[PDB]
Amino acid sequence: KDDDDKLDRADILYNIRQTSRPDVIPTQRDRPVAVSVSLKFINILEVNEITNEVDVVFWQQTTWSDRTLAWNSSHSPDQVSVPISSLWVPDLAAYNAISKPEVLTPQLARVVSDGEVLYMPSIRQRFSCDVSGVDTESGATCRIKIGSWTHHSREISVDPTTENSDDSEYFSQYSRFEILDVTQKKNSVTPEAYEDVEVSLNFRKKG
Amino acid sequence: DYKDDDDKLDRADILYNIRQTSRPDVIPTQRDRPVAVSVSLKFINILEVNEITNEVDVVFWQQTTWSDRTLAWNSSHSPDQVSVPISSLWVPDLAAYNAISKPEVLTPQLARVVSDGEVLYMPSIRQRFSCDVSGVDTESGATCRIKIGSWTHHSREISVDPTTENSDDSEYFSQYSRFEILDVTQKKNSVTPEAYEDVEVSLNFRKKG
Amino acid sequence: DYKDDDDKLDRADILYNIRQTSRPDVIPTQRDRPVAVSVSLKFINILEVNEITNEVDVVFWQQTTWSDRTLAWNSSHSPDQVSVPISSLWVPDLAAYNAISKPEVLTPQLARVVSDGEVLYMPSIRQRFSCDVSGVDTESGATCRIKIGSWTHHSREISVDPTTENSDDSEYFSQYSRFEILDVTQKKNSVEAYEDVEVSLNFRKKG
Amino acid sequence: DYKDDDDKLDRADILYNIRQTSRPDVIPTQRDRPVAVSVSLKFINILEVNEITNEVDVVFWQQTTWSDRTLAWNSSHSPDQVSVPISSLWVPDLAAYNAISKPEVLTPQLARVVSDGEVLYMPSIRQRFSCDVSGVDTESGATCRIKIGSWTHHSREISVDPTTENSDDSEYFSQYSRFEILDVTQKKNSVTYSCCPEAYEDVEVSLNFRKKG
Amino acid sequence: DYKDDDDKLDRADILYNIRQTSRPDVIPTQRDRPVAVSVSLKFINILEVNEITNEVDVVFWQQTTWSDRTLAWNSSHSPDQVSVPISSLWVPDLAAYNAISKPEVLTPQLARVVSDGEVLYMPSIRQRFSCDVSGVDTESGATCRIKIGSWTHHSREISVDPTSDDSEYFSQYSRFEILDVTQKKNSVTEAYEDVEVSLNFRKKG
Ligand SMILES: CCCCCCCCNc1cc(-c2ccc(OC)cc2)nc(N)n1
Ligand SMILES: CCCCCCCCNc1cc(-c2ccc(OC)cc2)nc(N)n1
Ligand SMILES: CCCCCCCCNc1cc(-c2ccc(OC)cc2)nc(N)n1
Ligand SMILES: CCCCCCCCNc1cc(-c2ccc(OC)cc2)nc(N)n1
Ligand SMILES: CCCCCCCCNc1cc(-c2ccc(OC)cc2)nc(N)n1
Ligand SMILES: *[C@@H]1O[C@H](CO)[C@@H](O)[C@H](O)[C@H]1NC(C)=O
Ligand SMILES: *[C@@H]1O[C@H](CO)[C@@H](O)[C@H](O)[C@H]1NC(C)=O
Ligand SMILES: *[C@@H]1O[C@H](CO)[C@@H](O)[C@H](O)[C@H]1NC(C)=O
Ligand SMILES: *[C@@H]1O[C@H](CO)[C@@H](O)[C@H](O)[C@H]1NC(C)=O
Ligand SMILES: *[C@@H]1O[C@H](CO)[C@@H](O)[C@H](O)[C@H]1NC(C)=O
């Protein structure tokens, strides 16, 4: 489009930085922020069948909308890159995580003109999950829950992205492991409930 | 009230109010009474136990609550609670006497402030400890004791009191651990110029068999 | 010119000028053409190679140049170039897709800004990758392919150019490494599109 | 006095006064005398002793006290002392000469300031050292010597001294450690040099320990 | 003069003067001539050595000095030197060409500034290098060569210059012992000045 007008872009960043409240949930019309999450698996590095611990690399594709960040893009760029400190991101956490997320990519989000925000960092992290079955035909099934840490369902709703296929599409052919199946469903932990996305990852050692 | 809880402007004003009254470095001491801090550990995972060196590597949710009345607001027609970055608030300077590594916070550092002045902060922590691991293979199991207390504030300034005194822990403990939990007991204890209050947390566990 | 290179106050003023003009978070897109970024990997060392898990641990110099002509100045009687802290300038958000650890930067985070608007940033980096190491014992060696692109900017926004392939490397590679380089190959490639430079390192053990 | 310790507005106002007087980067030399810094190490654990490479990994409470009287206030009806983030205070630049890892601080970084201008900062620290490890498995035990002094300030500027209570630390150290401690001594020492024409004061700490059996 | 070293207000004011005139991000070239930086490595310990992978883990005090005359003051009745956080000061962007890990700094990061404009910064560093360890178990030992110079400033802008067996500082408890340390100038190619430090050392026993 006009995507390459430096001044247009600098002005958009300015508008965003002035409207954006990095610490307040972008609720609209008094309804929960609808965040969407999807893990896209990239690698499985170490698996310990005795301790039941896995070390994985995945794209943590996250999206939501903040309509106040929107702008007329008839003759201005349709989207820009924004550093995540200038923005609100949802406070996601892996319930069965046993190491800090190690973010391997630049910490930038895209804000689209309609007001949609997308953050997709590439993350390496260790989890605690059922590893039993990893050396058989039918493999192991390790389950990861990603939800809001401090915000309950009425404040934030965490759903899976429309597309869960291609989940294993960018998975490294040089892993000692192979993905048999991935499912990504809604779930709610528990007076207040926290929504999360349960990722079931069915994988096996390459025989 | 629930009706007005997702009003963004209201949420932003509460954040502003709190950042104005909040003294992150001063204890929220009230009426010349010690700040009463409730600490409760909910164990999530036991990862690496060593029977020789007597060390363990645990993961627990540190449920911490206390009250700052001065952060209170009316809450009838605004949401009662909000998330606040903890750098904006006073949090107690708890430490574990027998920790042998830094606590690794695995969750976003956010507290919840309630309209009545109550502050709730519950990080997930992975930390190593020095404690009694002997008898871990045996049916009745090792009993590792963790002592968590205020680090610079003596007992006339901060009091620590544990909210759940006994349980199985069944709710939160990973079913995929090598270990099982028999009992968790938490007692208010004390150690002394002046006095420091703590919570002795006794984790009774054994290797599954 | 070269004779006024060491004039201290002339340097202070260029820095000041740069800091007043530079927009560290906006792509320096000139004349509605995507920022053309030059990348060259110049291998220094291979530290550890794992044939079981197919991970490799490498030390390289990431030679990176691009142009921001709004940063240019008249050097008739002032220095030709200066060093700027990387926080004062915009920097391409490059990422390695098959990276499995955070890029550990071994050098000072200083760039060079040339009086014509050229920015040169070349950090020394250590980083682990997941790549095909089968054959590293073998005389014809293994070939590890590292794919580096801009993480958030598509092709109309940022374009990657790699020079030169395959000419390096024998110049900077450690003679004391257990490994030796047979060849290096740096090629353009793409995937709206994300341009990237695929680097192919042909190496083998010594015997 | 002690009956006003939980006066919040007093504590807050004392913090205000301290942050206004305090020069975090300037040594608190009163009356052209060196700052008298007291250090004492109180050992909590020994975790890894490497017989091959002569390395120890230890956990100790590094007890540090000094005086800065400009920060002093009246104790007449404000709290005797308060806690302060160390970024608000000057802290002496202690280093261990035989440290081979960075100091890993296990505790909150708050110091205590007393109404008479006394400042105490006691972090729990886990750190690796390079010292003689031979004997660890014998009756007599190994003896590792740790020197802690000021890195940049010479003896005219800062004096480093051991503390009046020097039994410590024997009692605290965990009963669960593989090791046990035979003796601890903390003697004042003073290294001079060809590098620099001035003398750096320090405390030499001698830790005598053996494996249990 | 020493007499007034411990005047606190004199100290605070010197530090105020330094921070007011110091330009942390600009080379203190004087009189159209390159900054002359003094570098000397003082070996303290050698921890891990791998003759197979040719890798070495060392601890050394890095002595670094240079001049910025604009920092000079009149010390007639004030302190001769004071300590300054390096974030208030320009420091040379030195890098080890053959290093394979970040320099882990173990000491507090302060410089000393002398009333005549001399700046001394000497941090203790544990770093790992990629160097020839062949022949370490032998009586003549390995010779490991480390190369340090300005990472972004060519010769025209910064010169580095050397200034032993390091018996003074080296650990008696190291598995290893030092035969000889030599420090010589070298250039690499516009060109960069560096100091080659050659460490010659063997196993003990
Ligand atoms: C059956 C699901 C397995 C996962 C175990 C979760 C049990 C407890 N559920 C919670 C509690 C909180 C929580 C965190 C912090 C608070 O205060 C800051 C309050 C609640 N947050 C989430 N996402 N799940
Ligand atoms: C036996 C001799 C060993 C010498 C081998 C090293 C050759 C590499 N040359 C360089 C390049 C740069 C450099 C760094 C950054 C730039 O732009 C940001 C430009 C050049 N800096 C130095 N000190 N040596
Ligand atoms: C034939 C070899 C394929 C290997 C690489 C596969 C390319 C995958 N696609 C993407 C997506 C994004 C992306 C990143 C962040 C976003 O939002 C913040 C959106 C897209 N960025 C890049 N460079 N490639
Ligand atoms: C295994 C360890 C043996 C090492 C022996 C220790 C010798 C003591 N020498 C010094 C020098 C300096 C010093 C530091 C920086 C300077 O300028 C910035 C000058 C001197 N500071 C102290 N505390 N001890
Ligand atoms: C292996 C575990 C050993 C446990 C022994 C318990 C001894 C209690 N000692 C202290 C000292 C301080 C303390 C810390 C810092 C100070 O000044 C900054 C003052 C006192 N605080 C507490 N809660 N207990
Ligand atoms: C935005 O601005 C254009 C240009 O004037 C205008 O025609 C258009 O109606 C606006 N777009 C929307 C969706 O309102
Ligand atoms: C606000 O709070 C007070 C309680 O102090 C209550 O009387 C009042 O009705 C509430 N009304 C509001 C804010 O509408
Ligand atoms: C650059 O500056 C010099 C010296 O003033 C001048 O002679 C020359 O014409 C200038 N060039 C431009 C493009 O301004
Ligand atoms: C402290 O204030 C009291 C009154 O509470 C006064 O009597 C006393 O003289 C004061 N002391 C100092 C140090 O000024
Ligand atoms: C500063 O130093 C010069 C040295 O010649 C001397 O003339 C002058 O009196 C000094 N100033 C002070 C503070 O006395």
mmCIF file of C-alpha atoms and ligand atoms in Angstrom, chain C residues 61 64 110-112 119-123 171-172, chain E residues 95 97 147 149-153 186-194 196, ligand 2:
data_model
loop_
_atom_site.group_PDB
_atom_site.id
_atom_site.type_symbol
_atom_site.label_atom_id
_atom_site.label_comp_id
_atom_site.label_asym_id
_atom_site.label_seq_id
_atom_site.Cartn_x
_atom_site.Cartn_y
_atom_site.Cartn_z
ATOM 1 C CA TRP C 61 30.357 -12.182 13.308
ATOM 2 C CA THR C 64 25.038 -5.990 9.003
ATOM 3 C CA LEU C 110 28.210 0.016 19.190
ATOM 4 C CA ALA C 111 27.320 0.750 15.578
ATOM 5 C CA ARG C 112 29.176 2.785 13.007
ATOM 6 C CA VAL C 119 25.008 2.229 9.374
ATOM 7 C CA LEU C 120 27.303 -0.727 10.106
ATOM 8 C CA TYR C 121 26.605 -3.032 13.032
ATOM 9 C CA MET C 122 28.692 -6.185 13.423
ATOM 10 C CA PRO C 123 28.343 -7.976 16.709
ATOM 11 C CA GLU C 171 39.819 -15.684 6.976
ATOM 12 C CA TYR C 172 38.470 -15.476 10.413
ATOM 13 C CA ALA E 95 36.854 -6.897 22.876
ATOM 14 C CA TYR E 97 38.832 -11.520 19.273
ATOM 15 C CA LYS E 147 43.914 -10.696 21.348
ATOM 16 C CA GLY E 149 41.618 -4.256 20.984
ATOM 17 C CA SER E 150 39.003 -1.622 20.160
ATOM 18 C CA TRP E 151 35.934 -3.218 18.638
ATOM 19 C CA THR E 152 34.677 -0.222 16.622
ATOM 20 C CA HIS E 153 37.440 2.395 16.644
ATOM 21 C CA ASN E 186 50.078 -5.932 16.752
ATOM 22 C CA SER E 187 47.762 -4.632 14.048
ATOM 23 C CA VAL E 188 44.925 -6.275 12.132
ATOM 24 C CA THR E 189 43.235 -5.262 8.851
ATOM 25 C CA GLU E 190 41.587 0.707 7.817
ATOM 26 C CA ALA E 191 43.394 -1.074 10.696
ATOM 27 C CA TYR E 192 42.797 -1.901 14.354
ATOM 28 C CA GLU E 193 45.333 -1.788 17.164
ATOM 29 C CA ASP E 194 45.372 -4.701 19.595
ATOM 30 C CA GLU E 196 48.486 -9.881 21.926
HETATM 31 C C1 LIG F 2 46.741 -13.039 14.089
HETATM 32 C C2 LIG F 2 45.874 -11.782 13.788
HETATM 33 C C3 LIG F 2 44.391 -11.909 14.296
HETATM 34 C C4 LIG F 2 43.425 -10.818 13.684
HETATM 35 C C5 LIG F 2 42.034 -11.397 13.174
HETATM 36 C C6 LIG F 2 40.812 -10.389 13.305
HETATM 37 C C7 LIG F 2 40.298 -9.674 11.966
HETATM 38 C C8 LIG F 2 38.927 -8.858 12.088
HETATM 39 N N1 LIG F 2 38.957 -7.348 11.899
HETATM 40 C C9 LIG F 2 38.272 -6.379 12.802
HETATM 41 C C10 LIG F 2 36.973 -5.771 12.431
HETATM 42 C C11 LIG F 2 36.359 -4.833 13.360
HETATM 43 C C12 LIG F 2 34.935 -4.069 13.114
HETATM 44 C C13 LIG F 2 33.823 -4.080 14.005
HETATM 45 C C14 LIG F 2 32.592 -3.358 13.780
HETATM 46 C C15 LIG F 2 32.392 -2.570 12.621
HETATM 47 O O1 LIG F 2 31.205 -1.878 12.395
HETATM 48 C C16 LIG F 2 30.214 -1.945 13.465
HETATM 49 C C17 LIG F 2 33.462 -2.515 11.701
HETATM 50 C C18 LIG F 2 34.695 -3.257 11.969
HETATM 51 N N2 LIG F 2 36.995 -4.532 14.540
HETATM 52 C C19 LIG F 2 38.209 -5.130 14.825
HETATM 53 N N3 LIG F 2 38.872 -4.818 16.047
HETATM 54 N N4 LIG F 2 38.873 -6.042 14.009
#
